[PDB]
Write a protein that binds this DNA or RNA. Sequence first.
DNA 1: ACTGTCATAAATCTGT
DNA 2: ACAGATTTATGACAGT
Length: 104
Amino acid sequence: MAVEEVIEMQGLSLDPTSHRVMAGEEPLEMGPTEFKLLHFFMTHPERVYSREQLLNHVWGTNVYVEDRTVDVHIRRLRKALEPGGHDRMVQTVRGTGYRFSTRF
DNA sequence: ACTGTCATAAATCTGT
DNA sequence: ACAGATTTATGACAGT
């Protein structure tokens, strides 16, 4: 089928059709760049991504900003998932980039 | 209201 | 153990 389908993993559920993020069946709220970065991470758990890979996928290939736009948006995404208990999935690889994980 | 940039603090790696 | 160089986290502000 071509209709989109909800992703539910480790108590966190994201619906691409409704643009709706919920943790433990209680909603969380975020902007659309934050949602797209979260959608990219939840479709790719257990892989390391540099700020360049995140820029080409989420912001766009021919779109231009500094690398440290990613750092501020990572803080905004963690701040958003923090009262939902799910900031700790979003992990940091020093000197390279970031990684998303179920636990470890 | 949402995203991009800068400033300062904390954290990491290597050399002595 | 401490200092210097490089990276990352956080808070405030501007532009559109």
